[PDB]
Every structure is written in C-alpha cells, then in structure tokens.
Symmetry: C3
Subunit: 479 residues, 3 copies
Amino acid sequence: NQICIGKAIKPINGTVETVSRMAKVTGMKKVGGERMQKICAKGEQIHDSSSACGIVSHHLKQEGCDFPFLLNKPKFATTGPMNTSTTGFNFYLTEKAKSWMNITWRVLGENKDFGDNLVEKYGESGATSEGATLKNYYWYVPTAKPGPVVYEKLAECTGTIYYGALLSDAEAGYIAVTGRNVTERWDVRFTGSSESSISFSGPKQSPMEEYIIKSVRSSVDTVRNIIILDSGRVKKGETFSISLSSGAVVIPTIFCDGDFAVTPQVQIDKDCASDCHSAYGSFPNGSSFIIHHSVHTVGSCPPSILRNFDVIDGYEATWEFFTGGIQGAIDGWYGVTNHDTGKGTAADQTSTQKAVEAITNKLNEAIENGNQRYNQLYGLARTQAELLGNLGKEVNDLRLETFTEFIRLETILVNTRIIEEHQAIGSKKKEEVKRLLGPNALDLGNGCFNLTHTCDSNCVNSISRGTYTRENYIHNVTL
Amino acid sequence: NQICIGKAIKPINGTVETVSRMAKVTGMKKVGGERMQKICAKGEQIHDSSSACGIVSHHLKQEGCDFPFLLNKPKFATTGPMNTSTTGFNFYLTEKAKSWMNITWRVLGENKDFGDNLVEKYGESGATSEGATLKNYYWYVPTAKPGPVVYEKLAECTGTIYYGALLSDAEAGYIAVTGRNVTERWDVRFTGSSESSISFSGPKQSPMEEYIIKSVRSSVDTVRNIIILDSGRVKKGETFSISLSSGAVVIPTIFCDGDFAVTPQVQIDKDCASDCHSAYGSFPNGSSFIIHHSVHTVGSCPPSILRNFDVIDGYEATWEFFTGGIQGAIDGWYGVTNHDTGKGTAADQTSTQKAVEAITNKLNEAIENGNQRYNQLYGLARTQAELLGNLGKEVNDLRLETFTEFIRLETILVNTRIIEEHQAIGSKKKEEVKRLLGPNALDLGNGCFNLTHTCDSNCVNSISRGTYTRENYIHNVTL
Amino acid sequence: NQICIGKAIKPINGTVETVSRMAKVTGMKKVGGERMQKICAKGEQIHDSSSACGIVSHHLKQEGCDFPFLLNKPKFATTGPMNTSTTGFNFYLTEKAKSWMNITWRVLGENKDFGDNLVEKYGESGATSEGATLKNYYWYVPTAKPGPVVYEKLAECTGTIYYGALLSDAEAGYIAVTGRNVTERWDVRFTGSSESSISFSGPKQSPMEEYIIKSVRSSVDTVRNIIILDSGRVKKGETFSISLSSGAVVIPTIFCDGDFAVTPQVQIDKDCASDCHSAYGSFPNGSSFIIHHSVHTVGSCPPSILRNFDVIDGYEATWEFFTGGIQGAIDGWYGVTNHDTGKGTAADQTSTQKAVEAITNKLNEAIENGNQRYNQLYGLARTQAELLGNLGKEVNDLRLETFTEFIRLETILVNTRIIEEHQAIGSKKKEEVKRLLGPNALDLGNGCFNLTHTCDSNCVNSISRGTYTRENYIHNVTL
Ligand SMILES: *[C@@H]1O[C@H](CO)[C@@H](O[C@@H]2O[C@H](CO)[C@@H](O[C@@H]3O[C@H](CO[C@@H]4O[C@H](CO)[C@@H](O)[C@H](O[C@@H]5O[C@H](CO)[C@@H](O)[C@H](O)[C@@H]5O[C@@H]5O[C@H](CO)[C@@H](O)[C@H](O)[C@@H]5O)[C@@H]4O)[C@@H](O)[C@H](O)[C@@H]3O)[C@H](O)[C@H]2NC(C)=O)[C@H](O)[C@H]1NC(C)=O
Ligand SMILES: *[C@@H]1O[C@H](CO)[C@@H](O[C@@H]2O[C@H](CO)[C@@H](O[C@@H]3O[C@H](CO[C@@H]4O[C@H](CO)[C@@H](O)[C@H](O[C@@H]5O[C@H](CO)[C@@H](O)[C@H](O)[C@@H]5O[C@@H]5O[C@H](CO)[C@@H](O)[C@H](O)[C@@H]5O)[C@@H]4O)[C@@H](O)[C@H](O)[C@@H]3O)[C@H](O)[C@H]2NC(C)=O)[C@H](O)[C@H]1NC(C)=O
Ligand SMILES: *[C@@H]1O[C@H](CO)[C@@H](O[C@@H]2O[C@H](CO)[C@@H](O[C@@H]3O[C@H](CO[C@@H]4O[C@H](CO)[C@@H](O)[C@H](O[C@@H]5O[C@H](CO)[C@@H](O)[C@H](O)[C@@H]5O[C@@H]5O[C@H](CO)[C@@H](O)[C@H](O)[C@@H]5O)[C@@H]4O)[C@@H](O)[C@H](O)[C@@H]3O)[C@H](O)[C@H]2NC(C)=O)[C@H](O)[C@H]1NC(C)=O
Ligand SMILES: *[C@@H]1O[C@H](CO)[C@@H](O[C@@H]2O[C@H](CO)[C@@H](O)[C@H](O)[C@H]2NC(C)=O)[C@H](O)[C@H]1NC(C)=O
Ligand SMILES: *[C@@H]1O[C@H](CO)[C@@H](O[C@@H]2O[C@H](CO)[C@@H](O)[C@H](O)[C@H]2NC(C)=O)[C@H](O)[C@H]1NC(C)=O
Ligand SMILES: *[C@@H]1O[C@H](CO)[C@@H](O[C@@H]2O[C@H](CO)[C@@H](O)[C@H](O)[C@H]2NC(C)=O)[C@H](O)[C@H]1NC(C)=O
Ligand SMILES: *[C@@H]1O[C@H](CO)[C@@H](O)[C@H](O)[C@H]1NC(C)=O
Ligand SMILES: *[C@@H]1O[C@H](CO)[C@@H](O)[C@H](O)[C@H]1NC(C)=O
Ligand SMILES: *[C@@H]1O[C@H](CO)[C@@H](O)[C@H](O)[C@H]1NC(C)=O
Ligand SMILES: *[C@@H]1O[C@H](CO)[C@@H](O)[C@H](O)[C@H]1NC(C)=O
Ligand SMILES: *[C@@H]1O[C@H](CO)[C@@H](O)[C@H](O)[C@H]1NC(C)=O
Ligand SMILES: *[C@@H]1O[C@H](CO)[C@@H](O)[C@H](O)[C@H]1NC(C)=O
Ligand SMILES: *[C@@H]1O[C@H](CO)[C@@H](O)[C@H](O)[C@H]1NC(C)=O
Ligand SMILES: *[C@@H]1O[C@H](CO)[C@@H](O)[C@H](O)[C@H]1NC(C)=O
Ligand SMILES: *[C@@H]1O[C@H](CO)[C@@H](O)[C@H](O)[C@H]1NC(C)=O
Ligand SMILES: *[C@@H]1O[C@H](CO)[C@@H](O)[C@H](O)[C@H]1NC(C)=O
Ligand SMILES: *[C@@H]1O[C@H](CO)[C@@H](O)[C@H](O)[C@H]1NC(C)=O
Ligand SMILES: *[C@@H]1O[C@H](CO)[C@@H](O)[C@H](O)[C@H]1NC(C)=O
C-alpha cells in the first residue's frame, strides 16, 4: 500500500514568542528560581545580641560586644538600633558616618591595626577615667600645645577609617585641653582616595552648640565628654595623610572590604539545608538565575533579574487527510506508520535524542553569554560592601534594569535557534528514505510515499532499523 | 480554459525596512505627530502680570501678587524677570534658590502652612516698619540672646522650603539684634532628605561684604534691610529639623510637587481647541507619540521621542507571463480572473478585512509594549517638577536618547510580523481551492489552475462565493 | 545529455554567526585595526624639556619654559614631574588644580589675555624682588585696605582660570599686607559656569598651618613667600565674576579648550610615516575602527571599540550525486558544466561582480549607521580636553561599553543581509535558463536540466554568453 513518517500527536500546552511569530508548543519551563517562605539554616550558627549591645559599641570594643574581632564569624547577625546608649562617653555622628556604620560593623573579612606605629611615633595616649570600659581609641595630647602635625602612612587593604574629636562641654576643660581661644574655628582634614573635613569651635559658639543639643546621652548621668566622628576612605597601594592638632581622635583600625552578614526578617527553620539565602527567604538548589531586587546575598548564588520568562521544552505542533501527525500510541517523538493502529506503527530513537541534546547545547551557550555580559557590566574585581555603600539611601539600581532587558532579548533568539535546528533535523530524515527505496517508487511530496507492492507490518518495521531490502518484495504490482 | 487567483496591481509608493531586506510597499504612514504653528486656547484662561510683579514678590505675598494662593489656577502664566525690584526689603539669593524659584512659583497643586505651630511654640514674631506690604514671613527674636534651639516637625507632602536671614548693614543694629561680636562666624543648617548650610558674619567682614555689594536694591531708597535666602527639600512621611538662632528667618509654607504652567512663546489663537500644548505649539488630536525634546507639557499627552519613523500601511508588491498580479479593475486586495477584463474578473472580501485587522492588532501590541518600557524607565510615581528641578542647567537628557532607540528597534519587528502574517493569510486560500475542485484537475504550481473543460464568467464568479458544483460542468473535454 | 549550473567547490575556512544559525564560509576578515609596536614619526617635531622645567613653571612663564606661548606647537611633548621645584616662590595646589594642570599645560589651541583691562581698572600691580624670573601674574594691593571689590567680565572662549593668594609666613608681613587681624577667616569666591571658594587665616592658625607644612620648597633657600592656587571654569558667551580683597592673586590668561599632545611611552622610530598615533603605538592606514581604551589620540582617527569581530568575505558552502558544486577548475564563483572536466565546464562573470558589489554596499551602510550612533552618543560639539577633564581619576568609561554592544548587534544583521542577497542573486539565474530553453525540456528541480538531444562542449558554452539557438540542435531524440 503506502507508508508515512512524521511526529506523534500530543495535546497543546502553551505558546512562546519568536522573532517573527508566536508558536504553539507542547511544553515549556522558566529560567528563574522563586523565593521560599522561610530560611533553611541547618548546620549554621546564629548570632544575637539585641539585648545588650549597640552598633557603636561594637566598633569601640565595649565589654562583651566584640563581633568584628572573632576568628569564626557566623553568617546571620542581629543587634540593637543605632540610637542605643553606651556605658562610656556621649557620641555624635554625621550622615556619612551613619550610612557607612550601617554596614561596617558586620564584615566577614580581616581587619588591620596600626596603633603601635602611632604610639612609637608620638608617645603614650591621653588618659581619662570615663572610658574604663572602652579600649579601641587613641587620644593625641602633646606636651606643647597646639603643635600641629601631619601623619602619613601606606595602606594595606581597601576600606574605611573613622576620625574626629573628643571634648567636654565645660569652658575651663576646653581651654586647658585645646590651648586655643574660645572665639576661634579650627578644622581637621582627611585626604586619601577622596577628601573630607570637619570643623570645631568653643562651647558657647557655633557649631558646637548644635553638637551639644543633638548628642545621645549615656547610661551614667555624670559624664561630661562628647566624641564626634566622621569617615574617610583609603586604597590598597597608595598613601593617606591626616592633619592632627591637640585634641583630635582616631580609631586605629582599617575595616577591609568584603562580604557582610544578613539580618533575618522571617521565620527561621532548622532541619533543612540550602546554599543561597537572602533576608526574606532561601532559593532552590542548582538555579541559573535568581528573582531578586538587589545584589546582597550569602553563599554561592547566580546573578539576579527582576522578572521571569518562558523557554521552550517540547516541539512545535503543526497539524490540524494526512497533515503530519500519527494517531497511534508510540514512546517517542517521531514515527513511521501505514495507516494501521497497534501493530502497523513503529518509532525511532536517534532523532529523539538528537532533538533532546540540541536544547541543552543552546541553553548552555545562552547562559554563558549572559554570565559574560554580567561580568562586563559590573567588573571583575568587585565587592558587595563597596557597591552598596556607594548607593547610599537610594533603593533603585539602574544597572539591574539595563541587565534585565538583555535576557528578554536573548530568550527570543534561543527559541528561534531551537526551532530552526529542529526543522533542520527533521529535513534530513526524509532524504535518507528516498535514496534507500530507489527510483522506482513515486513520492507524494508531503512526507507520504506510495509503493508498487503491498507493504505489511514487517515491511514497516524493517525500515525502522534500516535493514530493509528490495529483493523479497518485488512480487505483484499495484498503484 | 484556465483560471488564476492573486492580488491587484497598484502603483508603488515607497520602501520600508525589515530584519533581512528592504521591501517595496504601496502605502505607509508615520507614528509621531508634528507641532503646529500656534497655540489653540479656546475655553481657557490666561494670566499675565508682567507689568507689576516679580518672581520673588509672589512668594512673599506682596499686595496684588498672589498666584500661589488661588482656588482656580490658569494653565498659562507670564511674569517679570527675576531681577525685578520689590517694595519692601532688599534681597539676595544663591544659585540653588534661583534654580528652584524658576519653577516653584507656578505649581498647580496645594500648598501647606505651619505658621501657627511656630507662633504657639516660640511666641510672636518680630516686627519692623519696612515690611508693611508683605505678610508671608516669620522672624525669630527671643528675649534672651542668642538662645539657640532646634525645631523638628513631621511633613505632610513632598516639596521645598526656603530659609535664611534678615539683617541690616549698620553695625549698631547688628549688635543690638544678634547679640554677638563682630569678629565671629555663625551658621544656619537644614537637615532633611538632604543637608544644607549657610554662614554669616559681621557687616565689615567676610562674607557679608559680598552680600551687601551683590544685593538688588528696592524701589524705596531709604531701606536698610537685606534678606538672604536658601533652599532645602523634604519628604512626605519623615521628620525634618532646623537649627535656629536669634536673627534667622523662615517662610512658613511647603510648596508641594506636581505640575506647573507653561509660558507662551509664540502667537496665541482663539476659536480653536486641542488637548495637548507645549511652549512652542500644540499637537493634533489622538496621537500615540509626540516629537518633542522634553517632558514638560500640560493636558493629556503621550510619551515623547526625538525623531519620526515609517510603518507599513498597504501590502508588498511582488511582480514585474503570469507573475501574481491581475490587470483588471477590482474593489479589493485579492481577486480571481480567467484572462478576461471587465466581466471575467471577481473579488473576494474576507481576506481583505482579515489583512486589515492584522495591522491594527500588531500596532496596538507594539504601542502597549512601548508604554510599559517607558513606565519602567521613568518610574510609576513621578512628578514633572522634581524631574526638571533635579536636572538644573543641563539641557540634554540621556534617558530620552535611550528610549528613542527602543522604538526604532520595535518598528522593524512590527514590519516583519505584519509581512509574515500577510504571507500566512495568503497561503491558506490556495489550499481551499485544490480540495474544492477535486483530484481530476492539474495544478501548475504557481497559483494558476488549468481545467478539463471550458470555464466561463459564471464559472468564475460561482467560485468566489464558494457555491461551485461540478455536476453541470462535466460536459466536453479539453487540455 | 544533460547540463547543470552552480558554484565552484573550495576548501572551507571558517564560521560566522547569523540571526538564526551558524554558517560555514570560505573567507572572512575583521573590522578593527590593531596597534603596532612603535611610533612612526617621520616628518614631525618632538619637544623635550625634562631636564629643566616643571609643570607649574610653564604656566608662570619662567625663563626658558614657554610651551603654551608658541606659534607652532609640536604634537609630542615631555616634561618633568608635578613636584619639581622652581626658581621663584613656594607653591601649593589643591586636588582640582592638580587634575586640571595635568592637561592644561599642553593644549594645541590659542590662549587669551586680559591683563591690560585689570591694569587700567585698578592700577599697577604689586612688586616684589623674589619673582624677578616670572612674568605671568597680577597682585592686587590697593592703597586703602582691605577695600573689597567685585570684578565682572564677558568671556571669549571656553576654558579654565586659576586664582588664589600669595602670602608670607611672617606675622609682621601678613599684618602689613592684608590689613586684617590674625584671629579672622576670609574667603575668595569664584562664580561662573559653576561655583568655587577658598579660605585663609593668619599664619599661626588653621588652615594656614597645614599650607605651610605641605608646601613645596624652592631652589633658593631664602624665599619666604607661598602662593596657593585653585581653579574655575568659564563659558564662551556668558559673564564671570570674582570677589577680590587686598592680597588676592590671579593669573590673567584663559586656556581655551581643544586638543592636547601625547607623551611617548615606547620606542620612537623615524623613517616611517602614518596618520593616527596613541601613547602606546600607531595604527595602520585607512582603518574604519580602532581597538583602543580611550578617546585620546592625535591626527585623523575613527571611533574606538574594546574588542574585534568577524565579517564574511566569501560565499557560504552548501554541499557534501549532484549537490550544487562543480568539481572542475574555473576562475569564478559560478559555472556551468556537463559532467565533463577540462573542456566541458565554463564560467560566467556578471554574477561574480554583482556578488562582489553587494558586500561593499552593505558594509558601507553599516559603517555610516555606526558613525551616526557615535555622533548621537557623544554630541556634535565635543572637545577631548573637556571630556577627559570631567572624568577625573576614573579609568572606566561607561559610554564605550554601551557603544561596543551596538557593533556586535550590527554585525549579525550585516551577515544576514549579505547571505539573503546572495540567495536572491542566485535564484534569478535559474529562471533565465528555463524560459530560454523552452517548454520541450523537462527540469529535475534541483538545478540540473535534462535535454532531448546530445549537448557537447560547444553546446555548453553557447549558453554561457546566451547566444544559444535551438534550430541547429533539433536532430536526434534521446531521454
Ligand atoms: C542598612 O542597610 C540595609 C541594606 O541596604 C537597609 O535595608 C533596607 O531596608 C529597607 C527598608 O525596610 C528595605 O526596603 C523594604 O523592602 C521590602 C521588600 O519586601 C517586599 O516584598 C514584597 C512581597 O511581600 C514585594 O512585592 C516587594 O517588591 C518586589 O520585589 C521583587 C524582588 O523580590 C521584585 O522583583 C518586584 O518587582 C517587587 O517590586 C520591587 O520593589 C522594590 C522595593 O522593594 C523596588 O526597588 C523594585 O524596583 C521593584 O519595584 C519587596 O520584595 C518592602 O516590603 C518595604 O516596604 C521596603 O520597601 C530594603 O529592601 C532593605 N535592603 C535590602 C537589601 O534588603 C537598611 O534599611 C539600612 N539601615 C538603615 C537604618 O537605613
Ligand atoms: C526656567 O526653566 C525653563 C524650563 O526648563 C527654562 O526654559 C528653557 O530655556 C532655554 C533657553 O531659551 C530653552 O532653550 C532654547 O530652546 C529653543 C528650542 O526651540 C528650537 O526650535 C527649533 C525650530 O525652530 C528646533 O530646531 C530646536 O531643536 C529641535 O528640537 C526638536 C524638538 O522639538 C528636536 O527633535 C530636534 O532634534 C531639534 O534639535 C534639538 O535641540 C535641543 C535644544 O533645543 C537639543 O537639546 C536636542 O538634543 C536636539 O538637538 C528647538 O526646538 C532654541 O531655539 C534656543 O536656541 C534654546 O536652545 C529651553 O528649551 C527651555 N526649556 C523648555 C523646556 O522649553 C528657562 O530658561 C529657565 N529660566 C532660567 C532663567 O534659566
Ligand atoms: C594625566 O592624564 C593622563 C591621561 O589620562 C594619565 O595617563 C594615564 O595613566 C595611567 C597610569 O599609568 C594609565 O593606566 C595604565 O594603563 C596601561 C595600559 O597599557 C596596557 O597594555 C596592555 C598590553 O601590554 C593591555 O592589556 C592593557 O589593557 C588592555 O587595553 C586594551 C586597549 O588597548 C583593551 O582593549 C583590553 O580590554 C585590555 O584591558 C583594558 O584595560 C584598561 C586599563 O588599561 C581598562 O580600563 C579596560 O576596561 C580594559 O579592561 C593596557 O592597554 C597599563 O599597563 C597600566 O597598568 C595602567 O593601567 C592610563 O592608561 C593613562 N591614560 C591614558 C589615556 O593613556 C596620567 O596618569 C595623568 N597624570 C597623573 C599624575 O595622574
Ligand atoms: C541542596 O543542597 C544542599 C547542599 O548544601 C544539600 O545539603 C546537603 O545534602 C547532602 C545530601 O543528603 C548531605 O549529605 C549534606 O550533609 C547536606 N549539607 C549540610 C550542610 O547538611 C541539600 O540536601 C540539597 N537539597 C535538596 C532538596 O536537594
Ligand atoms: C480635538 O479635541 C478637542 C477635545 O477637547 C475638541 O474640542 C471639543 O470639540 C467638541 C466637538 O465639537 C466640542 O463639543 C467641545 O466643546 C470642544 N471642547 C472645548 C473645550 O470647546 C476638538 O474639536 C477636536 N478637534 C478636532 C479637529 O477633532
Ligand atoms: C600611510 O599614509 C601616509 C599618509 O601620511 C603615507 O605617508 C605619505 O606617503 C606618500 C607616498 O609615498 C609620501 O609622498 C608622503 O610624503 C608621505 N607623508 C609624509 C608626511 O611623509 C604613508 O606612506 C602610508 N603608508 C603606507 C604603508 O601606505
Ligand atoms: C497511492 O496508493 C493508493 C493505494 O495503493 C491509491 O489509492 C492512490 O491512488 C495512490 N496515489 C497516487 C498518487 O498514486
Ligand atoms: C502544561 O504542562 C504542565 C506540566 O505538567 C502542567 O502543569 C500544565 O497544566 C500544562 N498546561 C495545561 C494548559 O494543561
Ligand atoms: C531610637 O530610635 C527608635 C527607632 O524607631 C525610636 O523608636 C526611639 O524613640 C529612639 N529613641 C529615642 C530616645 O529617641
Ligand atoms: C587669646 O587672645 C588673647 C587676646 O586676644 C591673647 O592674649 C592670647 O594669647 C590668646 N590665646 C591664644 C591661645 O591664642
Ligand atoms: C493549460 O490550458 C491551456 C488551454 O486550455 C493550454 O494551452 C495549456 O497547454 C495548458 N497547460 C498545461 C500545462 O496543460
Ligand atoms: C504615497 O501616497 C501618499 C498618500 O496619498 C502620497 O501623498 C504620496 O505622494 C505617494 N507617494 C508617491 C511617490 O507618489
Ligand atoms: C535684569 O536682567 C535683565 C535680563 O537681561 C537685564 O537686561 C537687566 O539689565 C537687568 N537689570 C539690571 C539692573 O541689571
Ligand atoms: C565680645 O568680646 C568681648 C571681649 O573679647 C567680651 O567681653 C564680650 O563678652 C563679647 N561679647 C559677646 C556677645 O560674646
Ligand atoms: C536524464 O538524462 C540521462 C541521460 O540522458 C538519463 O540517464 C536519465 O534517466 C534522465 N533523467 C530523467 C529524469 O529523465
Ligand atoms: C583562511 O584564509 C586565511 C587567508 O589566507 C588564512 O590565513 C587562514 O589560514 C585560512 N584558514 C584556514 C583554517 O586555513
Ligand atoms: C616627587 O614625586 C616623585 C614621584 O614618584 C617621587 O619619587 C619623589 O620622591 C618626589 N619628591 C619629593 C621631594 O618628595
Ligand atoms: C583688631 O582687633 C582690635 C581689638 O579687637 C581692634 O582694635 C583693631 O581695630 C582690629 N584690627 C582690624 C584691622 O580690624
């Protein structure tokens, strides 16, 4: 009789978008992973000191508040608010100091110390009885006042340094310590990778009057000392300089850049593990992209996007009289039949696995291209702490918006390439049958052949393995 | 004889650009609307006070200059230049104050007042005889000088606040009012969503000497008072603070953000109406995009672009021996003929209307995509006043340049999709005829069939409605 | 017998990337030019004063250091480091001054002078014996001190102006010159296209103490004068103002913007010429794009990119029983044969030259589009000096990264268009032969015809120039 080849009919599932049209497919999936409803923290440590410490207390090494000086640092931390009192002095901070101290207290790297150099250069530090419980500071009080100097040093890592002043609100103490006159203004300047400065004057003058009013009082109500801070930045291989006068203060530590821990905001669950966490949940194992609105994460995580897209997973449906589909039931994507159901239908295997492999190859290439584009956009030598510190109070990142469009543009090309490859694979099989049958059989030109003799089920399945021969089927003639 | 189907030949009009080639089409149009030569302002109000007021006079509520305190505000306004004198004090402004006052005097929203809170907190305001014609200011003069304080308040909308000082150039008055010494420097600071400050000193010192020289004199030549201003920004839900000392001044009003009117620059015409206006003309009704170089407009207007593009409006011309065109005259885009003119040609209707609808569908989808991209680029909660205030003196916007390329990229995809859809529509009609005629008629494979018998005009037009039958045409045989 | 037409088989060279697939081609090239290992400077002048001058000495017109006051300026220059001493005063610079003097000393344009206006407005300049070897400065010392003034002037070009102070470290000299008190602070302000200021006080006070310590000493060890500088910017058509008090100093010259020379970093070679040079080498003649990481160059150079790409140069290979290739040896890209080698094969010429011209046309259009995009990105009225001055210490430019992706996107479209045009050219030739042979010869449908009679070598080459006739080949019949 006659034989035909083609695909197997399956119900339609969805539609995808290509360059020139919309296609109907029997299966599709997504590229991104979705957030969970909890945090999986099996085999981890959690640090919590929300009842005793504050943000400032950690920097100054108060008694019992020493997160940044530990050998092993947990990846989850929580502490009190920024306006929490201490047990030593009263303190005042500027806006930049607040912005950088929101981050610098929980870095996961190593910190550098240079107090001994100052001690050996200028002698012993000043002493007071109101700071018995604090350790990390250096007070410059020379014998001859004011005696300005300039201190220069070569840095070791990239990070931030805090500097400022420490003064009392009594006029007699101010005159005895500074050695200046009340009706004067004097500055402290920091020059590094950038430039910064701060100004001071007498107690009953500007701008010290505002500092006294805006300060945060301490637990002990008999403390008369206020310390005012500000920040500056350094670089690894260069030299930084500070101008010093009698009365200035500096914290002798460099907080090197790196990664910082996250603060949980949802319920914490044990007895389950993962490898990528955020402040609002975890993510599934082995993902290629993450649906997130920032770049702050702990663990090993892929890049981030703002929304999700669809990618083909099956094959296109092109059918409704032969049209290209086979009504039989077969365990494959391609088949050969002779208008018989149950025994007159057979399936091949090579085309199925080739079509399977094409998708994986194309998807891997697209993922690699996306990774390279991300690296170009953000740079090879990047640090999360610096990236989030530079943003400040802004919650919108333009680079994420720029990156999101690239994936949307790439998905269409991926779909088009996959479909064209499937068509190319399908085209070749039709040629291997025409040359195999010979030139004595006519072809309908629509994938269905029509043979000179009768072709039974064995005739059909012998073609599938390709061991077909013409010698034993010559008998009888029919059209 | 034989019959053929195809399109109708029409003269060529232009060319369009697709992904892979340039196409020749019989009709095209544009996406953007062009500016007019005048302003259509029928049924509108125009405000003009160019002969009496100035920009500063409006903020201080001078006698007869009260634009920002009206229930109904017109959409067109004009006033005098910025260096126009007043009838009260002498005044001095900084650069930021000038930049923001170029806009804040003509907002179309609501303004908030908080003078009563200050009055009930610190008592009555200071009094002088040189400001009898002004109302909108508060002067802080306590009994004990200087007496610094800090004032904190929770805001209601998002906007700008002006603050500064008011002093005389006589030494005795300065000492009597401020209560300080001449050889001193004192500051006023504003902290909100950002930070700002300003400094003052005695009359025969810096920087007051420059303030005296650079000031703008008043109409009355016996005024000895200069008021110096500066600006700051607030946010809706947060708290803002001001540092006050004896002698400072603040204008107790918040100018909320929103839209502001335009100043006509061309001839104004009545007796004609529109719904979108700019400073250089109006735009036609019902446009989808606007050819304009800014985002400042009044009314209901679509997004803006920097140049214009072309979009297909007819069908592609593919012809020069049959080639695919019909030389007859028909009232449609598709037809059937038998090499006869006048009576041997007929036209169908379904294909024409389907091809008509495809263009509308594709164009609507493209427009929606463009709107979504614009919203992503600029943000959902946006205000024109803030957007133009942040730019400053720059006249080039990069976001418009980024947005312009997106439309150019989208137009090519639109054209490609439309052409492919037209080809898909055309392909199906050829199949419905082969199955209708039957298997006893050969096909030339180029859209022309060739029938076994003679096929007259009734034979031709019966096919058009699809009521063709084979029983009554069997007689005679010819090839 | 039978005849066939097609291409000529050549070995495969490489692969290129298109919209929907990867193609195999017999030839390809690149779009960008690569750097050399030296500098070609035949017929050029080189300036070198690394042994006597410094950067600061050039601005002040020291004896023998006068680069910015020459009629003809060489395109290569080199001088000493920034901290080189002079023979006059001691000097101090800020960060912005350093950043701008890294560039302004080697501009190739014209500079403007306005000293005579100052002389005629305020009289003769101050005189000192420590600056006998310097000429380019103006010192304001009026008879009555301090006597502040404001100086306003309309500019001529766009550029930078340096201003500041000149003072001694002795208390008596300070009091005698300035006419102020030691416990005071006074400022100098510059308002133009932007705003800037600087502050000064007494010798044993802040911030003069830091200035004295950080200064650079002069060759003569008996000089007691320090000059402190800062910078400001102007615009062509506007007015700029300066606040002056007794003791200020200004350099009366405007350094107009333009191009500046390069400093060689590699070996310099004569006896060879080019037309585009950089600091690390030269580039080949007649290039369309340059592989560079900046926009600083001298000569006539095209735009710059960060990496290189591939562009097709031959024709696609589509073959492995005829498949479309001819095994004969021909001097062309297309040919006709009759399964005979040596004398039964001929080549045409028109198709070859048409295919050659298509590539040139498409490439030229792409290059023009790229040029227009570059002009849109950077602006029509641009200056290298201003562009690099605004960047500062940053070594990464985002606009180059944005521009690099455009070329990568354009190359794919170029390849697709070229391939489609080649297919369109190839398709038409097959039609001109079917109509020429007539309707009495069958066609195999794969580019090979099959004729009713025998067709020899003269028969083959008769088709080549198209003068074939059917009358003399009618004899005999065969299939
Ligand atoms: C010290 O530094 C810390 C680190 O920077 C500071 O932490 C930030 O604090 C902010 C104040 O609380 C906080 O902002 C909040 O964010 C919350 C986010 O949770 C929401 O959950 C919703 C579902 O329940 C989401 O719908 C919502 O938005 C979505 O986010 C998706 C990503 O998961 C997007 O794909 C979606 O499009 C969707 O919309 C986005 O919203 C973003 C804003 O959240 C927006 O930027 C983006 O463009 C999309 O439009 C969101 O996920 C909100 O519920 C709160 O209302 C509030 O906005 C920051 O997130 C904190 N930063 C980080 C990195 O977590 C800390 O404040 C600082 N300390 C001090 C004292 O300043
Ligand atoms: C208070 O705030 C106000 C609001 O910001 C300030 O108003 C601005 O004042 C500026 C100074 O006058 C003014 O700049 C002028 O703009 C005019 C524009 O008119 C021109 O008309 C020509 C035809 O006759 C056009 O060819 C020309 O440019 C075109 O614009 C098309 C859009 O319509 C573009 O599609 C074209 O490409 C073309 O070229 C553009 O030109 C733009 C500059 O105009 C350029 O930015 C863009 O990239 C294209 O290259 C233009 O339309 C000019 O004639 C004047 O020469 C001058 O440039 C601003 O437009 C005002 N702002 C607004 C929003 O109108 C006000 O100054 C301020 N007060 C104070 C004291 O500062
Ligand atoms: C006054 O102004 C001057 C002008 O701005 C200042 O000159 C700058 O001085 C810098 C300090 O020396 C200098 O930075 C150096 O650049 C060198 C570049 O030479 C390298 O050669 C290598 C081959 O041997 C390349 O591999 C290397 O990088 C490549 O560059 C290619 C372009 O040729 C790119 O296509 C490649 O991708 C590749 O990688 C790039 O590197 C770039 C950094 O160089 C990077 O920005 C880019 O994104 C790519 O990643 C490079 O070509 C280095 O060897 C040195 O290590 C150092 O980085 C600047 O180049 C100078 N500026 C100019 C315009 O030349 C001068 O400092 C200033 N005076 C003062 C006192 O400040
Ligand atoms: C997701 O990946 C994590 C990898 O950290 C898996 O956690 C490990 O699972 C293996 C397999 O049982 C255990 O031997 C390890 O002890 C686990 N790690 C830890 C730290 O306990 C986790 O099982 C994976 N989850 C899923 C669903 O596959
Ligand atoms: C453009 O649209 C405006 C919409 O404001 C039209 O103005 C209105 O036109 C209708 C129809 O005559 C009138 O009844 C209204 O009174 C008009 N509005 C006002 C405020 O007077 C305008 O006619 C339209 N123009 C064109 C050419 O269509
Ligand atoms: C590259 O172009 C330069 C153009 O400046 C060529 O230099 C000129 O070459 C011509 C031809 O011999 C000479 O007559 C000129 O005198 C050269 N210019 C100078 C300034 O000497 C150079 O020869 C070209 N190089 C190549 C390899 O083509
Ligand atoms: C194909 O074969 C079937 C049965 O053998 C026959 O009915 C049909 O006419 C054949 N078709 C052609 C085109 O020969
Ligand atoms: C498509 O397949 C998925 C996977 O099984 C299934 O969840 C979904 O319901 C299917 N779509 C439809 C419309 O049935
Ligand atoms: C400290 O800050 C928290 C943050 O909301 C606030 O509730 C609390 O009132 C503040 N403490 C004081 C003393 O103002
Ligand atoms: C303070 O001023 C007085 C008088 O002006 C002066 O005698 C004294 O030396 C000054 N003190 C300092 C530390 O400068
Ligand atoms: C088509 O019909 C016409 C007239 O009936 C005839 O001249 C021509 O040869 C026919 N073509 C074919 C291919 O049969
Ligand atoms: C194309 O059609 C428009 C609309 O009628 C017409 O204005 C234009 O002249 C036409 N183009 C040509 C080349 O005739
Ligand atoms: C005020 O500004 C205008 C703007 O051009 C100017 O013409 C006028 O001279 C200025 N008035 C004074 C007094 O300078
Ligand atoms: C001004 O200075 C003098 C002397 O230095 C002092 O007696 C007087 O109290 C000062 N006045 C004020 C308001 O500080
Ligand atoms: C083509 O011609 C050759 C020789 O003339 C012959 O062997 C072959 O069968 C012909 N092919 C067809 C389809 O007629
Ligand atoms: C491709 O052609 C170029 C030009 O001659 C040659 O240098 C290169 O080796 C060729 N490629 C291969 C793989 O032979
Ligand atoms: C001047 O700068 C160079 C730059 O490296 C440095 O080597 C030299 O030591 C500096 N001179 C002085 C006196 O510091
Ligand atoms: C400096 O101060 C003294 C006392 O305060 C005063 O007598 C003298 O006039 C002042 N000198 C100047 C130049 O202001």
